[PDB]
């Protein structure tokens, strides 16, 4: 329906390539991927689209974000759901990869171009924000905020106040917010020091269109777009007993559960309605506003071909596909 | 393992005197005296509620949190009142005004740091902490405002340790206060997002259960509070005894909350017979499950017959067969398959201690997580809108540094909490 | 030669105290004699404290009594991952200190209670760490699987679909005893609506005595623990025979006692006597180790079994010509001085893999799905260092155990 799903495999990593043990999934054709190659489970998985390891950021940009931009420009709020294995590398090269063309860079340019054309023809104004969910506290990345308090408007569409947005001057101004933000989140000191993978990063862009062609006095269409980087799941080891991870992992584990339970309930609410508990998390309640409604959504899962990704990519394909596959 | 009780506001304090009146006899602790215990088992586990200092002076490890001096000055000037170390009395000689905002933002907010100081002195006592018991009414300044702040701070300092709450939800028929739904809707809002076990008790559900199930014609408050304190002993301290199948606050929590909201339960005691005549001893066991699972006998206002159960915990305490227990629970699950929910193959959590309530042969605390409690947060949330529409006594809250959006927030949350509870009634 | 034991979870320790009671009682070793050969594990102190306070107090070393003063929790995750992790190293250290002291051991008779927190989750990793440190040994786990309708924990199936998947690739032969299908023996075959837990524990205390105690003891047809998993498991899944006893007669009511071999052996295959709600509804036996004890002529057995091999309504598997391990011990059973057990001069402690547990597993798996389909108590395990993975991926595990116990039978 509105939901469309695409999974983009990312090349095996230099070390993963050179070793080569049984591949987690073995991508068969472009769309169908077999899990657990010989027998073994030998599970065929279908998706709506799938992109192979050869498909880079630029191909996923064009695929994923093209139905996003059009709907975003139409005034339909859009979101991108990221996924990926817990192990970085696929997710590392999927997001924040400057060298890779960036799904986010080409879609930010794609929107940024389309935004300039809508402004010349029509008066279009936009704004952007960048927030994270670390410790289940929302931080703005642009300004050093504290815990955003919750209010509800007349619509009562739940607002975390104290968010600041600036209007997109160029993509360069956005790049400064991306830099400010990306350095504002900490690395996670557990394991190897990753980026802010374990914290959920959110990018927000708000389109606001008035028509010059339409009367000045008209309804304004606004969409919200969001891109979310999520954590990976934690094992016993990657968790650990330690009190240092302890807080962070509790925040992530309940965020992942309540969020993924809201994603499963989201697919059920493509039948259903008020059933889906928006309230189970702070961000999952804002995710209702974006992902709820009949809005065009896409999930991009990451998958690596490495054997390390055996568990992680199988669990993420399992969880992403589970919400599709369940229908009553 | 260990707990630290919390006597927030006058009602939670008045009940604290009754909770500790009971528990101490259930542990042979005289006023400042030691363990006189008729047995030896009422001592291998006391640590749960007390501290070692002298060698005869096991002191209750509670907190007494009140902005009204005359209350804690009636609890401390009466019977067991001289057991509490004076360090436990976190008084606020300020005006204890009946406003949730006055006890949460303005007058309670100052006294909190001098509370958290002691909640840490008592949590850092020794061994391993389990959680905190909380007693209060949802109908007043110090109960619902300040007592709900104390937990919003406890749940930030120890998000690992459990949080039991004993709320005196506003009774339907007559409200013992006027702003009541204001104080209530604003505390249940904090409760649904901090504590993880709530036991809601209603002064009139008690009067019914205390005037018809006890022929008691003059049910004083001391009696209501005594009945309540009889359950919260059969919950906690009870399961800190041996048993063929014991549990503890976590087993209770980890069997009784299917969804993270917290969920609120409805306690029920077992042998609830009037004194002389009704000492029928029809307490073999089918008579306890007969008792606990009827409508009346639930300390909540709402009737369980009006909604499915998600979980039940019959926390028995008295020597009985693990067959006539585990069996009876089944026929109860099948006679009433209608109201019990179906996506849980076994709703009931059987729990069995050995030692019974001092003077009795056999009892069983009931802790029901029924969807029937929907028909109470409905009640509270109605009384709110009917007066919130006109901003009735709202100038007492905003004039104490509040927000027109804060009332909106709490209603909408606790009114969503009604919606969610119906998702499982269906 | 020896077999250590590891009694885990409160119930694995209550059964432990009872199997351990019946031992000294048939070996003339009163309260203070030799030394035990086992350990006790719980994340609730008050229960292992019943072995430190109650009977059999000084028969143990405080070193073979592991406790985590912390919290049991009726959830696998916490008891496997989060908490039960902290204790494992210390636990292993005993089953490595007790395993060194001996002389050429054979294995560890584990005692756990499937649908617990400490009995599910901890043992899962205990057996895990054993199959690696001692893959060259026997790993016979004696479970008390979930009652078919009379479960206790609300979550039970979450705990028991997670002990099965994690231990499956690690056990050698998993004995099973159902708590409810024992109460039917206490009601029907003993007459008592007063079965305390202390009695089911005498009855597993009895069947278990027949396994290790009397069979590690000399006899006319000895059967090592390796002989079990060899003569009892057809396939590498940690296959789960059922325990059954024969002279379960009452020591008060009826008295026919003198029930020659020809009778006690027939009293094993009737479904009303097998400590398991896995009534042979279709389940073909595939291998049975009839342990006898007491006065038994090998011809009475090699005739009392021959009659059974030709009953045909007992239908063995096709690929199994003869699946009858006769074990004969000398010393008769040894009943509790004044419990309720008859006291006969012979018994049959038959155990067997049956295709019947195709049911028991199916009915326990279907349970799990109904709650997991709504997540139910999932937030209690995810907050404890687990994932959507370990549930969904241990569910897929037991799915190929519904198919394994279907394919190994029903077909020819
Ligand atoms: C001669 C005799 O057997 O007297 C009984 C008695 O008559 C009855 C009626 C008791 C009596 O209880 C009440 O009348 C009552 C009064 C106010 C509120 C609630 C109840 C009794 O007072 C209560 C008392 O309870 C206990 O001793 C328990 O240990 C109980 N203790 C307290 O509540 C307590 C009271 C005063 C001071 C300190 C503690 C308890 C229950 C659960 C958990 C912990 C403790 C008992 C058996 C009796 C009397 C004395 C008449 C009953 O109540 C309880 C809680 O056991 C009322 O129905 C039961 C059935 C009992 O048979
Ligand atoms: N036969 C027998 N079954 C028992 C005994 N004690 C408990 N059980 C059963 O085992 C299960 C109970 O496990 P629990 O006592 O809750 O837990 P545990 O496995 O000891 O570990 P925790 O959950 O962490 O406390 C239930 O299915 C009981 O019916 C016992 O002494 N004998
Ligand atoms: N059971 C019970 N309820 C009480 C007691 N005292 C006050 N209440 C109830 O508490 C509500 C009033 O709140 P109150 O305790 O005075 O608030 P506070 O003292 O300002 O925190 C009313 O609904 C009363 O019925 C008591 O001792 N026992
Ligand atoms: O998705 N993200 O939010 C994200 C998560 C991480 Cl860890 C890293 C980056 C990004 S980004 O903004 O896509 C981005 C993409 C390209 C350049 C800067 C930022
Ligand atoms: Mg236990
Ligand atoms: Zn005879």
Per-domain boundaries in chain B: 1-258, 259-372, 373-426
- SS3 of residue C153 by DSSP: coil
User: What is the 3-state secondary structure of B261-297?
Assistant: CCCEEEEECCCCCCCCCCCCCCCCCHHHHHHHCCCCC
Helix (H, G, I), strand (E, B), or coil: what is residue C383?
coil
Chain position carrying tokens 């999520």: A230
Is residue A90 one of the residues assigned to a domain?
A: yes
Ligand showing the shortest atom-to-Cα distance for residue C249:
6
The answer to whether B197 touches B235, Cβ cutoff 8 Å, is no
∠ CA B191-B196-B198 to the nearest 5 degrees?
Answer: 65
Domain ranges for chain C, please list them. 1-241, 242-356, 357-412
Report how far residue A126's alpha carbon sits from residue A222's, in angstroms, rounded to the nearest whole number: 9
Alpha carbon distance, N-terminus to C-terminus of chain B: 39
CA distance A229 to A92: 10
Beta strand A297-303 with B89-91 is: unpaired
Structure tokens at B375: 């028909």
β-strands B363-370, B264-268: how paired?
Answer: antiparallel
Q: Is C90 on the interface with A (CB under 8 A)?
A: no
Asked if residue A165 belongs to a domain, the reply is yes
Is the CB of residue A221 less than 8 Å from the CB of residue A74? Answer: yes
* Local structure of residue A186 (DSSP, 8 states): P
How many CA atoms does the CB half-sphere of B242 hold within 13 Å? 18
- Closest C-alpha to ligand 3, atom 24: B176
Closest residue of chain A to B157, computed from CA coordinates = A247
- Cα torsion B396, B397, B400, B404 to 10°: value is -130
Which among C85, C389, C396 has the least Cβ separation from residue A311?
C389
Tokens at B40, concatenated: 């030896």
Contacts by B414-420 with C-beta closer than 8 Å and gap 24+?
B414/B185, B414/B188, B414/B189, B414/B192, B414/B377, B414/B380, B414/B381, B415/B377, B415/B381, B416/A279, B417/B188, B417/B192, B417/B261, B417/B377, B418/B374, B418/B377, B418/B378, B418/B381, B419/A274, B420/A277, B420/A279, B420/B259, B420/B261
Phi-psi map region of A164: left, alpha, beta (phi>0 left; psi -120 to 50 alpha): beta
Superfamily for domain range B373-426: Helix hairpin bin (1.10.287.600)
Helix axes C388-407, A309-325, angle to 10 degrees: 80
Q: Across the interface, do B412 and A258 touch by the CB < 8 Å criterion?
A: no
CATH number of C357-412: 1.10.287.600
Nearest residue (by CA) to ligand 2, atom 20, is C10
Name, in order, each residue with C-beta under 8 angstroms of B93's C-beta and a sequence gap of 6 or more: B67, B69
- Measured CA to CA, the distance from residue B281 to residue B361 in angstroms comes to 9
Q: What is the C-alpha separation between C294 and C300, in angstroms, rounded?
A: 13
Longest dimension (CA), chain C: 60
For tokens 């000045």, the residue is A216
Task: Give the rounded distance of the alpha carbon of A124 from its chain centre.
Answer: 25
Instruction: Return d(Cα B270, Cα C8) in angstroms, integer.
Output: 33
Q: Which residues pair with B132 in a beta bridge?
A: B163
* Tokens matching residue A118: 């809508």
Which residue of B127, B311, B322 is in closest CB contact with C154?
B311
C396 contact residues in A (CB cutoff 8 A): 41
Give the Cβ contact number of residue C199 at 10 Å.
24
Indicate whether A292 belongs to any domain.
yes
The secondary structure of residue C176, as a DSSP letter, is E
3-state secondary structure A114-177: HHHHHHHHCCEEEEEEEEEEECCEEEECCCCCCCCCEEECCCCCEEECCCCCECCCCHHHHHHH
> Is residue C126 a contact partner of residue C22, using CB atoms and an 8 Å limit?
no
Number of H helices, E strands in chain A: 10, 13
Pocket probe for ligand 1: among B221, B360, B364, B365, the residue whose CB has the most ligand atoms within 8 Å is B360
Bridge partner list, C221: C328
Cα(C215) to ligand 6 centroid in Å equals 27
Where does chain A break, by residue before each gap (C–N > 2.5 Å)?
A: 38
Is B257 close to ligand 2, i.e. is its CB under 6 Å away?
no
Q: How many alpha carbons lie under 13 Å from residue C53 in its C-beta half-sphere?
A: 10
Instruction: Enumerate residues 6+ apart whose C-beta is below 8 A from C112.
Output: C8, C9, C11, C12, C119, C120, C123, C141, C142, C143, C144, C163
Q: Phi and psi of A204, rounded to 5°? A: -120, 135
User: Quick one: A324 exposed, middle or buried, by C-beta within 10 A (0-12, 13-18, 19+)?
Assistant: middle
* Domain ranges, residue A132: 3-184+195-325
B143 lines ligand 3 (CB under 6 A): yes
Distance CA B313, CA B327 (A): 15
Residues 6+ apart with CB under 8 A from A121: A212, A213
Nearest to C66 by CA among C34, C35, C98: C98
Give me the resolution in angstroms, 1 decimal: 4.8
B337 touches chain C (CB under 8 A): no
- Give the separation between CA C116 and CA C127, rounded to whole angstroms: 16
Please give the C-alpha separations between residue C148 and each of B15, C181, C366, in angstroms, as whole numbers.
43, 8, 11
CA A233, CA A246: separation in Å to the nearest integer? Answer: 14
Summarize chain A as % helix, strand, coil (round to 5). 35, 25, 40
* Three-point CA angle B155, B160, B166, nearest 5°: 55
Residue A167: Cβ-neighbour burial (10 angstroms; 0-12, 13-18, 19+): exposed
Distance, in Å, from the CA atom of B187 to the CA atom of B8, rounded to the nearest integer, reads 12
DSSP C183-240: HHHHHHSS--S---HHHHHHHHHHHHHHHTTTTSS--TB---HHHHHHHH-SSSS---
Interface probe with C: pick from B258, B333, B424, most Cβ of C within 10 Å: B258
Tokens matching residue B72: 């804690």
* B82 labelled binding-site residue: no
Interface test with A, best of B194, B257, B407, B416 (most A CBs within 10 A): B416
Which pair of tokens denotes residue B382?
């109605």
Distance CA B53, CA C157 (A): 45
SS3 A206: strand
> Which of B203, B198, B124 is CA-nearest to residue B164?
B198
Cβ pair C193, B323 in contact under 8 A: yes
Contact between C389 and A315 using a beta-carbon 8 Å cutoff: yes
Tokens 């790049």 sit on residue: A175
Residue C346 is classified by DSSP as E
Search chain A and give the residue with CA nearest C376.
Answer: A261
Is any ligand 4 atom within 6 A of the Cβ of residue A181?
Answer: no
From chain B residues 29-68, the ones with a CB under 8 A of any chain C CB are 44-45
Q: Which two tokens stand for residue A141?
A: 């990345």
A319, containing H or E segment: helix A309-325
- The active-site residue out of C21, C227, C263, C406 is C227
Ligand 3 geometric centre to CA of B203 (Å): 9
- Residue C367: which H helix or E strand, with range? helix C357-372
Q: Nearest by CB to A260, which of C81, C86, C388? A: C388
Report yes or no on A299 lying in a domain: yes
A85 annotated to bind ligand:
yes
CB A321 within 8 A of CB A8: no
In the structure encoding, which two tokens stand for residue B27, read together? 């542990």
Q: Kindly list the distances between the CA atom of residue B391 and the CA atoms of B235, B262, B398, C356, in Å, as whole numbers in the listed order.
A: 40, 30, 10, 68
Contact B319, B362 (CB under 8 A): yes
- Does CATH number 3.40.50.1440 belong to domain C1-241? yes
Alpha carbon C373 to its chain centroid, in Å, reads 30
C123-133 and C82-101 helices, crossing angle to 10°? 40
Please report, for the domain that includes residue A159, its CATH number: 3.40.850.10
Which CATH topology does B259-372 take?
A: 60s Ribosomal Protein L30; Chain: A; (3.30.1330)
Report domain B1-258's class. alpha beta
Question: Six-digit token pair at C371?
Answer: 């709650």
Kindly report the backbone phi and psi dihedral angles of residue B339, in degrees, each rounded to the nearest multiple of 5, phi listed first.
Answer: -105, 90
Q: Is B193 exposed, middle or buried (0-12, 13-18, 19+ CB in 10 A)?
A: middle
Q: B409 and A152 in contact (C-beta within 8 Å)?
A: yes
* DSSP label at residue B372: G
Q: Got the DSSP string for C285-325?
A: EEEEEEEEEES--HHHHHHHTHHHHT-STT-B-SS-S--EE
Give the gap in angstroms from C-alpha B114 to the nearest C-alpha of chain A. Answer: 24
Give the pair of three-digit tokens for residue C67.
């406790």
| Residue corresponding to tokens 């009940």 | B15
Dihedral sign from CA coordinates of B206, B212, B218, B222: negative
* Catalytic site includes residue C227: yes
Say how far apart CA B424 and CA B426 lie, in whole Å: 5
Atom 19 of ligand 1, residue of closest alpha carbon: B227
Nearest by CB: B254 against C151, C367, C377: C377
CA B11 to chain C, closest CA, distance in angstroms equals 32
Count Cβ atoms below 10 Å from residue B303 Cβ, excluding itself: 16
Contacts of residue B38, Cβ cutoff 8 Å, sequence gap at least 6: B28, B358
Query: Given its phi and psi angles, is residue A202 left (phi above 0), alpha (psi -120 to 50 degrees) or beta?
Result: beta
Integer Cα distance of C279 and A220 in angstroms: 70
Is B10 part of any known ligand binding site? Answer: yes
Is B290 assigned a ligand-binding role in the annotation? Answer: no
3-state secondary structure of C12: helix
Please name the residue whose Cα sits nearest to atom 14 of ligand 2. Answer: C116
Distance set, CA C398 to CA C78, C141, C163, C369, C392 (Å) = 21, 18, 11, 12, 10
Residue B235 burial by CB count (10 A; 0-12/13-18/19+): exposed, middle or buried? buried
Place of tokens 């090269």: A93
Could you tell me if B236 and B3 are in contact, meaning their C-beta atoms sit under 8 angstroms apart? yes
Quick one: CA dihedral C87, C90, C96, C100, positive or negative?
negative
**Cα-Cα-Cα-Cα dihedral of C339, C344, C350, C356, to 10°?**
-60
Strand pairing category for B59-60 and B50-51: antiparallel
Breaks (C-N over 2.5 A) in chain B follow: none
Q: DSSP character for A234?
A: P
C-beta atoms of A254 and C378 within 8 A: no
CA distance A209 to chain B (A): 30
Phi, psi of A235 (to 5 degrees): -70, 175
Return the CATH number of the domain spanning residue range C242-356: 3.30.1330.20
Q: Where are the alpha helices (DSSP H) in B56-102?
A: 69-75, 100-101
- How many structural domains is chain A composed of? 1
Instruction: Report yes or no on A23 lying in a domain.
Output: yes
Q: Is C207 exposed, middle or buried (0-12, 13-18, 19+ CB in 10 A)?
A: buried
**Nearest CA among B202, B111, B184, B107 for reference residue B150:** B111
List of chain B residues whose C-beta atoms are within 8 Å of the C-beta of residue A274:
419
Note whether A243 contacts C: Cβ–Cβ < 8 A. Answer: no
**Contact call for residues B132 and B4 (beta carbons, < 8 A):** yes
Report if residue A115 sits inside a domain: yes
Which residues on neighbouring strands pair with residue C187, listed in sequence order? none
CATH fold match for the domains C1-241 and C357-412: no
What whole-number distance in Å separates Cα of residue C220 and Cα of residue C330?
7
Put simply, the answer to whether B246 touches C44 (Cβ < 8 Å) is: yes
Which segments of C49-120 are extended strands (E)? 65-67, 107-112
Neighbours of chain B (3+ CB pairs under 8 A): A, C
């Amino acid at each position: 329906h509105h939901m469309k799903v695409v999974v983009r495999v990312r090349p095996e990593n230099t070390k993963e390539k050179a070793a080569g043990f049984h591949k987690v999934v073995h991508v068969v054709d472009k769309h169908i991927l077999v899990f657990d190659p010989k027998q073994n489970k030998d599970l065929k998985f279908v998706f709506d689209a799938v992109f192979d390891e050869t498909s880079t950021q630029s191909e996923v940009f064009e695929h994923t974000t093209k139905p996003i931009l059009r709907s975003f420009l139409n005034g339909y709020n859009c979101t991108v759901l990221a996924y990926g294995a817990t192990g970085a590398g696929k997710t590392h090269t999927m997001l924040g990869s400057a060298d890779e063309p960036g799904v986010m860079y080409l879609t930010m340019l794609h929107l940024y171009k389309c935004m300039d054309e809508i402004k010349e023809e029509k008066i279009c104004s936009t704004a952007v924000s960048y927030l994270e969910v670390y410790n289940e506290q929302i931080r703005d990345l642009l300004v050093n905020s504290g815990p955003l308090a919750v209010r509800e408007d007349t619509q009562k569409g739940v607002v975390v106040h104290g968010l600041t947005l600036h209007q997109p001057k160029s993509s360069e101004e956005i790049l400064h917010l991306l830099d400010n933000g990306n350095k504002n989140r900490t690395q996670h000191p557990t394991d190897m020091n990753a980026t802010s993978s374990r914290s959920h990063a959110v990018f927000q862009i708000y389109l606001r269109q008035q028509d010059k062609t339409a009367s000045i006095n008209q309804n304004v269409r606004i969409a919200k777009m969001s891109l979310i980087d999520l954590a990976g799941s934690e094992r016993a080891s990657t968790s650990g007993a330690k009190g240092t991870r302890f807080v962070e992992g509790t925040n992530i584990n309940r965020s992942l559960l309540a969020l993924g339970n809201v994603i499963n309930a989201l697919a059920d609410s493509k039948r259903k309605n008020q059933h889906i508990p928006y309230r189970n998390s702070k961000l999952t309640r804002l995710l209702k506003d974006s992902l709820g409604g009949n809005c065009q959504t896409i999930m991009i899962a990451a998958v690596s071909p490495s054997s390390v990704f055996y568990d992680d990519t199988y669990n993420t394909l399992k969880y992403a596909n589970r919400a599709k596959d369940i229908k009553s | 393992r260990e707990i630290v009780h919390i006597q927030a506001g006058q009602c939670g304090n008045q009940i604290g005197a009754k909770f500790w009146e009971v528990i101490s006899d259930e542990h042979g602790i005289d006023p400042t005296g030691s363990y006189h215990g008729d047995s030896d088992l009422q001592l291998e586990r006391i640590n749960v509620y007390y501290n070692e200092a002298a060698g005869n002076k096991y002191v209750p490890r509670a907190i007494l949190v009140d902005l009204e001096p005359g209350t804690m000055d009636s609890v401390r000037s009466g019977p067991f009142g001289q057991i509490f170390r004076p360090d436990n009395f976190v008084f606020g000689q300020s005006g204890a005004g009946n406003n949730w905002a006055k006890g949460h933002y303005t007058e309670g907010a100052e006294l909190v740091d001098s509370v958290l100081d002691v909640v840490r002195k008592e949590s850092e006592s020794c061994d391993c902490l389990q959680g905190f018991q909380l007693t209060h009414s949802l109908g007043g300044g110090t109960g619902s405002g300040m007592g709900t702040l104390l937990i919003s701070k406890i749940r930030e300092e120890y998000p690992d340790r459990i949080m039991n709450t004993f709320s005196v939800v506003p009774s339907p028929k007559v409200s013992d206060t006027v702003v009541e739904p204001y104080n209530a809707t604003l505390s249940v809002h904090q409760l649904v997002e901090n504590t993880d076990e709530t036991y809601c008790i209603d002064n009139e559900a008690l009067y019914d259960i205390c005037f018809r199930t006890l022929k008691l014609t003059t049910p004083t408050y001391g009696d209501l509070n005594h009945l309540v304190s009889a359950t919260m002993s059969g919950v906690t301290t009870c399961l800190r005894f041996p048993g063929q199948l014991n549990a503890d606050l976590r087993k209770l929590a980890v069997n009784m909350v299917p969804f993270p909201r917290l969920h609120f339960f409805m306690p029920g005691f077992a042998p609830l017979t009037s004194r002389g005549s009704q000492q029928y001893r029809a307490l073999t066991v089918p008579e306890l499950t007969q008792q606990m699972f009827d409508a009346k006998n639930m300390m909540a206002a709402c009737d369980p017959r009006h909604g499915r159960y998600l979980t039940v915990a019959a926390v028995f305490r008295g020597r009985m067969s693990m067959k006539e227990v585990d069996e009876q629970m089944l026929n109860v699950q099948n006679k009433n398959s209608s109201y019990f929910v179906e996506w849980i193959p076994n709703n009931v959590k059987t729990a069995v201690c050995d030692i019974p309530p001092r003077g009795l042969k056999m009892s069983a605390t009931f802790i029901g997580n029924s969807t029937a409690i929907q028909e109470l947060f409905k009640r509270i949330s109605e009384q709110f809108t009917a007066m919130f529409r006109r901003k009735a006594f709202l100038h007492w809250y905003t004039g104490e540094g509040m927000d027109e959006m804060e009332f909106t927030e709490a209603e909408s949350n606790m009114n969503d909490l009604v919606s969610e509870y119906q998702q499982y009634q269906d | 030669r020896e077999c250590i034991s590891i009694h885990v979870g409160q119930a694995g320790v209550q059964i432990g105290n009872a199997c351990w009671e019946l031992y000294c009682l048939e070996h003339g070793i009163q309260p203070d004699g030799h030394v035990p050969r086992a350990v006790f594990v719980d994340l609730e102190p008050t229960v292992i404290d019943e072995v430190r306070t109650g009977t059999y107090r000084q028969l143990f070393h405080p070193e073979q009594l592991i406790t985590g003063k912390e919290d049991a929790a009726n959830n696998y995750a916490r008891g496997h991952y989060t908490i039960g992790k902290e204790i494992i190293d210390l636990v292993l250290d005993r089953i490595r200190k007790l395993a060194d002291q001996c002389t050429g051991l054979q294995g560890f008779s584990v005692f756990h209670s499937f649908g617990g927190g400490t009995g599910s989750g901890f043992t899962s990793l205990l057996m895990e760490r054993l199959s690696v440190d001692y893959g060259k040994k026997s790993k016979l786990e004696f479970s008390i699987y979930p009652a078919p309708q009379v479960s206790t924990a609300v979550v039970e199936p979450y705990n028991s679909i997670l002990t099965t998947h994690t231990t499956l690739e690690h056990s050698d032969c998993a004995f099973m005893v159902d708590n409810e299908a024992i109460y039917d023996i206490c009601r029907r075959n003993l007459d008592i609506e007063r079965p305390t837990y202390t009695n089911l524990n005498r009855l597993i205390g009895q069947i278990v005595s027949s396994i290790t105690a009397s069979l590690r003891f000399d006899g006319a047809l000895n059967v090592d623990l390796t002989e079990f998993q060899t003569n009892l498991v057809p396939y590498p899944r940690g296959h789960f025979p059922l325990a059954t006893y024969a002279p379960v007669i009452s020591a008060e009511k009826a008295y026919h006692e003198q029930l020659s071999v020809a009778e006690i052996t027939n009293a094993c295959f009737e479904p009303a006597n097998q400590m398991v709600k896995c009534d042979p509804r279709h389940g073909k036996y595939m291998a049975c180790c009839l342990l006898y004890r007491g006065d038994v002529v090998p011809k009475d057995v090699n005739a009392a079994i021959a009659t059974i091999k030709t009953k045909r309504t007992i239908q063995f598997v096709d690929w199994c010509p003869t699946g009858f391990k006769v074990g004969i011990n000398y010393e008769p059973p040894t009943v509790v001085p004044g419990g309720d057990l008859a006291k006969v001069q012979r018994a049959v402690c038959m155990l067997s893999n049956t295709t019947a547990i195709a049911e028991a597993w199916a009915r326990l798996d279907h349970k799990f799905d109904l709650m997991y389909a709504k997540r139910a108590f999932v937030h209690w395990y995810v907050g404890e260092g687990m994932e959507e993975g370990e549930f969904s991926e241990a569910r897929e595990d037991m799915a190929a155990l519904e198919k394994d116990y279907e394919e190994v039978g029903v077909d020819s």
